[PDB]
Swiss-Prot record, chain A:
Entry function: Component of the ribosome, a large ribonucleoprotein complex responsible for the synthesis of proteins in the cell. The small ribosomal subunit (SSU) binds messenger RNAs (mRNAs) and translates the encoded message by selecting cognate aminoacyl-transfer RNA (tRNA) molecules. The large subunit (LSU) contains the ribosomal catalytic site termed the peptidyl transferase center (PTC), which catalyzes the formation of peptide bonds, thereby polymerizing the amino acids delivered by tRNAs into a polypeptide chain.
Entry's family note: Belongs to the eukaryotic ribosomal protein eS4 family.
UniProt lineage: Eukaryota, Fungi, Dikarya, Ascomycota, Saccharomycotina
GO CC entries: 90S preribosome; cytoplasm; cytosol; cytosolic small ribosomal subunit
Note: Present with 573 molecules/cell in log phase SD medium.
Highest taxon, organism lineage: Eukaryota
Stored InterPro entries: KOW, Rib_uL2_dom2, Ribosomal_eS4, Ribosomal_eS4_C, Ribosomal_eS4_central_region, Ribosomal_eS4_central_sf, Ribosomal_eS4_KOW, Ribosomal_eS4_N
Protein name per UniProt: Small ribosomal subunit protein eS4A
Curated annotation (Swiss-Prot), chain B:
Purpose: Involved in nucleolar processing of pre-18S ribosomal RNA and ribosome assembly.
Subcellular location(s) per record: Cytoplasm; Nucleus, Nucleolus
Native source organism of the sequence: Saccharomyces cerevisiae (strain ATCC 204508 / S288c)
Superkingdom, taxonomy of origin: Eukaryota
UniProt protein name: U3 small nucleolar RNA-associated protein 20
HEAT repeat copies, ranges: 137-175, 177-213, 303-341, 354-391, 441-481, 483-519, 549-586, 591-623
Signal peptide: none
Similarity field: Belongs to the UTP20 family.
Curated annotation (Swiss-Prot), chain C:
One Pfam family linked to the record: Ribosomal_S17_N
SUPFAM superfamilies: Nucleic acid-binding proteins (SSF50249)
Organism (species): Saccharomyces cerevisiae (strain ATCC 204508 / S288c)
The protein, known as: Small ribosomal subunit protein uS17A
Post-translational modification comment from the UniProt entry: N-terminally acetylated by acetyltransferase NatA.
Highest rank taxon of the organism: Eukaryota
rRNA-binding among keywords: yes
RNA sequence: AUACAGUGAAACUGCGAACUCAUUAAAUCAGUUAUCGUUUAUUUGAUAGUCAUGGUAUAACUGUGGUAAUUCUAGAGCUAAUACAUGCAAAUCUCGACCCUUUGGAAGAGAUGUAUUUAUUA
């Protein structure tokens, strides 16, 4: 199960001179390709811990809380729209992709860190006739707003796991793309169409009026036009 | 009353419920096999006597085991002694529960069914007679409060069966109960075909006829019931229902002397032929029409008109016999002639109000009807009434459109002419006559005719529809702005309904939006001359803020309708959207013009060359 | 004849009650295939029973949608369509046409002759070599 | 430590234990789908009302022995479980007449695990 340093993904931005073997992300909320391990986050990125032993010491000492709860696994997968709380420093980070296509932290405040946006991949009726939604991180949230459909974004309180607000998939809404050649791009969508012998294709317009087309499962509605619910890094 | 042991109380309650439902289930499952007579008194003393005092309040919410046992006792003839104990105490409790404010009709229904079964099944006992009389009195008291409360069609049918059984018994002889039953029957007749089944309606009519035969009726109540029966005979297409209404009219004529003559005329009109089943007598109908054309229309009273007016409307709506339709049109013309020959303005206005209540919506329905013969008969009747009567404004407008009765000048005469070229001349003449026709008259009359001409499937008739669409766009200015908005909503509904009609709807939308654009531009400019749209709102802000805020969702729907066939229709829709933008305020036009421009750009962005050329022609017209 | 085979041919989990006479001859179940393809009236009032039919069977259309010209209709409830796609050979320096044959299941609702352009859609493997089912016939 | 309580051999239990030789050109491989056609130890998020405490069978351990002898053995004696086997009507709701009295208290009438296989009904 040993993953090579060259075989490590480009999203992590590791230093190749560091070691022979890259960390392998554990099973968890996000898939292995778009995950970012906590050891990579703390050691190679935040430079807090110099080596994996004191990375394990930190994650023992429970300063690092991921999405509210406390994780002690060194290779715990932390992914897109994940809030990491370092309680000793009182600094909160939100993981967002860079425009070039790599992971990046964002310094966020406390009341921003209190909520998290998730893409509703499933809407279904569970047992005893209880509706539920399955978000992109794997969360199952009971009793949603009946207006919530597939590919809509829900703002989730971290303390309770409850949906406060939601954004509907609609033309002229600021979405974010999370896959493919277009990865790391922020833009409002022109439209959505069906591709013959293919899938739903979404046409998105950037700030500089450039048009780029991607898969339906790749998009992520971060907010409506002119009001992003989350903070965004400099450079748009 | 020891409340110290809630466990004991719950155990006692559970034992009571299980024991009662067990006794009920024993009663239906064993049936009429066990000799119940030996344990009858013991059972009634034990389980019925304490709960009998509060059974009426207890079982109001939902059916219960004790209530089901009572219903099975009422159904089984051998179990009648259970009810007969204590002078119909259980029956009185059930009747009180029915009479009280029950939570649901699901408890009211089976009690009425059991009462009907007990009435239908006779028993030879003095207690049986007393219980039957008490149940009949309770049902007669409860019936006006039960007919309204009954929300189920099966429950209404059961109530009608119980009323028929009560009428067969003849329990009530008072005229007040007859008046209450007549009011209930009128309320039942005021309904729908989905609400009341045809067999159920026939049974209700038979019960009403039996009640009318049993009870004497005053003149005013007989006239009200005759008007209701006339409306019912107009509504009922079934000849069995027509025969039932004829029997009811015969009963009303037995009740009242002038109603005897009226019902004799109605029965002569609606007399069924013996040779053809469920078919009226053509020679008798022709003789009645010949009498009504010359001697009848002077003889018939104002109240007596309404049954024959309903019969004539039904005959005109019926497409079975064109001769009968012509006879009905002649009868309507004779009624209009009687209204004109009445010297009093109030006497003419009574018939005018009767026509506006009945005959004018009937003519509107005939114009909207797809039946060409019925539409032509309605148009001919309208023209004859326009010639006969000088009072009525749409009649004056129709005379102005007739223009001294020339065949080419008259829109109706050239339409009745078989020549499509004459129809085109009529449409072109009506386009100029829209400047003189009334707005309400145009909206009531020419719009169904123009819609029929547009929806006609022939190619020459499609040219007629295009000319009528141009005339309708011209007359939309001559029409009221509310009528224009209603016509736009109807066109949007037709576009949503049929794609083939949508292209014609798109053309009509453009040809109505261009006068709308001109009127809105004149309102924005504040021109001293009156706007094109007749009776337009004084505030230019309100009409624009209604029309544009309605048309922008329509423009969005047209843009979202991204179909290749719809794109041709969307091009006239794009022209209408450009007209709406031009009619809007200039700053609002400057804001909304990026949206229409982007829609036109998406239309022209098609890779197909022929679609691009068509969109280019449309965009050239739009520019 | 719908009952030609030795086993009884019925739509699964559809029960018409012998106690109650029905105005329809048999209860029949039809499903909207999706992708904007209308359910044909032959499938609506057909008497045929087919598992592999996208409108009246358990087979659902998902994946790709293709178009092709019908070549052979000899085999039962299956057709062979030919798709001609232009190919570039660098050594020849010129575009050269190539064809691929796709054996496609045909529902009995559609009647296809040789040389008719048909629209097909991907489904679960119908047989050893069949993965495509017709959904629109032009 | 007058049940054990520190640290703990053995044992029971639980988890992990998924180099050589032969040469295929729609095969392999590379992408690309599909799984409304499938399986899950783990991770993560959900999820379960429908006796102050049951009976054993053994290991390690005692002992008596057989074999030239193996991580081979038989006889008798011991006692533990997150081993194996066994096993428990109330409460919550809806319709609540009527009462006052509006929030309200209540005559009463009724309802109520999960899994497996199939048939039937939305």
């Amino acid at each position: 199960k040993h993953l090579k340093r060259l075989a490590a993904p480009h999203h992590w931005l590791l230093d190749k001179l560091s070691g022979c073997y890259a960390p392998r992300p554990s099973a968890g909320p996000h898939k292995l390709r778009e995950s970012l391990p906590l050891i990579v986050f703390l050691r190679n990125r935040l430079k807090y811990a110099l080596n994996g032993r004191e990375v394990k010491a930190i994650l023992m000492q429970r300063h690092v809380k991921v999405d509210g709860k406390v994780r002690t696994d060194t290779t715990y997968p932390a992914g897109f729209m994940d809030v990491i709380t370092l309680d000793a420093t009182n600094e909160n980070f939100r993981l967002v992709y860079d425009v070039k296509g790599r992971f990046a932290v964002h310094r966020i405040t406390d009341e921003e860190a209190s909520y998290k946006l998730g893409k509703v991949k499933k809407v279904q009726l569970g047992k005893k006739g209880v509706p539920y939604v399955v978000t992109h991180d794997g969360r199952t949230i009971r009793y949603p707003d009946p207006n919530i459909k597939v590919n809509d974004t829900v703002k989730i309180d971290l303390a309770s796991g409850k949906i406060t607000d939601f954004i509907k998939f609609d033309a002229g809404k600021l979405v974010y793309v999370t896959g493919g050649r277009n990865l790391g791009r922020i833009g409002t969508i022109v439209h959505k169409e069906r591709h013959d012998g293919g899938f739903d294709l979404v046409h998105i317009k950037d700030s500089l009026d450039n048009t780029f087309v991607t898969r339906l499962n790749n998009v992520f509605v971060i907010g409506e036009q002119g009001k992003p619910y989350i903070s965004l890094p400099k450079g748009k | 009353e020891s409340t110290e042991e809630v466990h004991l109380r719950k155990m006692a309650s559970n034992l009571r419920q299980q024991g009662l439902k067990c006794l009920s289930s024993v009663f239906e499952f064993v049936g009429n096999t066990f000799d119940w007579s030996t344990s009858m008194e013991d059972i009634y003393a034990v389980v019925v006597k304490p709960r009998i005092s509060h059974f009426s309040d207890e079982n109001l919410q939902q059916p219960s085991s004790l209530l089901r046992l009572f219903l099975y006792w009422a159904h089984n003839p051998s179990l009648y002694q259970f009810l007969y104990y204590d002078e119909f105490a259980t029956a009185t409790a059930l009747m009180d529960t029915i009479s009280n404010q029950h939570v649901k009709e699901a408890v009211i229904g089976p009690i009425i069914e059991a009462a009907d079964s007990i009435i239908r099944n006779p028993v030879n006992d003095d207690h049986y007679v007393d219980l039957v009389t008490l149940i009949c009195t309770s049902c007669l008291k409860i019936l006006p409060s039960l007919y309204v409360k009954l929300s189920d069609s099966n429950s209404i049918s059961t109530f009608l069966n119980l009323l028929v059984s009560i009428t067969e018994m003849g329990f009530i002889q008072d005229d007040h109960v007859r008046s209450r039953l007549i009011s209930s029957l009128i309320s039942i007749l005021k309904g729908k075909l989905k609400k009341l089944q045809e067999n159920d309606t026939q049974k209700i009519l038979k019960i009403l006829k039996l009640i009318v035969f049993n009870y004497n009726c005053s003149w005013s109540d007989i006239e009200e019931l005759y008007t209701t029966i006339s409306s019912l005979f107009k509504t009922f297409d079934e000849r069995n229902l027509r025969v039932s209404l004829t029997e009811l009219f015969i009963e009303l004529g037995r009740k009242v002397p002038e109603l005897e003559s009226i019902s004799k005329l109605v029965a002569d009109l609606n007399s069924y032929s013996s040779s053809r089943m469920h078919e009226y007598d053509f020679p008798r109908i022709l003789s009645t029409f010949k009498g009504l054309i010359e001697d009848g229309y002077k003889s018939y009273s104002e109240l007596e008109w309404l049954p024959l007016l309903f019969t004539f409307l039904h005959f005109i709506n019926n497409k079975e016999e064109l001769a009968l339709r012509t006879n009905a049109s002649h009868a309507i013309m004779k009624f209009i002639d009687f209204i004109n020959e009445k010297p009093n303005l109030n006497e003419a206005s009574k018939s005018i109000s009767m026509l506006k209540d009945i005959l004018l919506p009937n003519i509107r329905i005939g114009l909207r009807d797809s039946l060409e013969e019925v539409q032509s008969e309605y148009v001919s009747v309208l023209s004859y009434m326009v010639k006969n009567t000088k009072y009525f404004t749409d009649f004056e407008d129709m005379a102005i459109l007739l223009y001294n009765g020339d065949e080419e000048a008259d829109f109706f005469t050239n339409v009745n002419h078989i020549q499509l070229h004459r129809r085109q001349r009529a449409i072109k003449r009506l386009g100029e006559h829209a400047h003189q026709l009334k707005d309400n008259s145009i909206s009531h009359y020419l719009i169904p005719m123009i819609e029929h001409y547009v929806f006609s499937d022939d190619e020459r008739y499609r040219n007629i529809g295009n000319e009528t669409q141009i005339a309708i766009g011209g007359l939309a200015q001559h029409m009221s702005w509310n009528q224009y908005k209603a016509l736009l909503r109807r066109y949007i509904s037709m576009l949503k309904t049929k794609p083939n009609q949508m292209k014609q709807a798109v053309q009509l939308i453009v040809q109505l939006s261009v006068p709308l654009r001109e009127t809105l531009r004149i309102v924005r400019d504040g021109a001293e001359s009156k706007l094109t749209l007749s009776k337009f709102p004084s505030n230019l802000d309100e009409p624009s803020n209604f029309i544009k805020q309605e048309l922008y969702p329509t423009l969005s729907k047209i843009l979202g309708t991204r179909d290749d066939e719809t794109i041709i229709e969307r091009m006239p829709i794009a022209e209408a959207l450009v007209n709406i933008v031009l009619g809007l305020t200039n700053d609002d036009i400057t804001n909304f013009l990026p949206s229409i421009l982007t829609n036109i750009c998406q239309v022209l962005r098609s890779k197909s060359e022929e679609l691009r050329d068509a969109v280019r022609v449309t965009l050239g017209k739009i520019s | 004849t719908v009952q030609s085979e030795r086993a009884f041919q019925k739509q699964p989990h559809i029960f018409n009650n012998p106690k109650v006479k029905t105005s329809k001859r048999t209860k029949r179940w039809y499903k909207n295939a999706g992708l904007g393809f209308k359910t044909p009236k032959t499938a609506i009032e057909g008497s045929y029973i087919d598992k592999k039919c996208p409108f009246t069977g358990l087979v659902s259309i998902r994946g790709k949608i293709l178009t092709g010209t019908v070549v052979s209709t000899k085999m039962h409830r299956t057709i062979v369509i030919r798709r001609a796609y232009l190919h570039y050979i660098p050594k020849y320096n010129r575009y050269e046409k190539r064809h691929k044959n796709v054996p496609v299941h045909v529902s009995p609702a559609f009647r296809v002759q040789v040389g008719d352009i048909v629209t097909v859609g991907q489904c679960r493997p119908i047989s050893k070599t069949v993965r495509f089912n017709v959904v629109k016939v032009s």
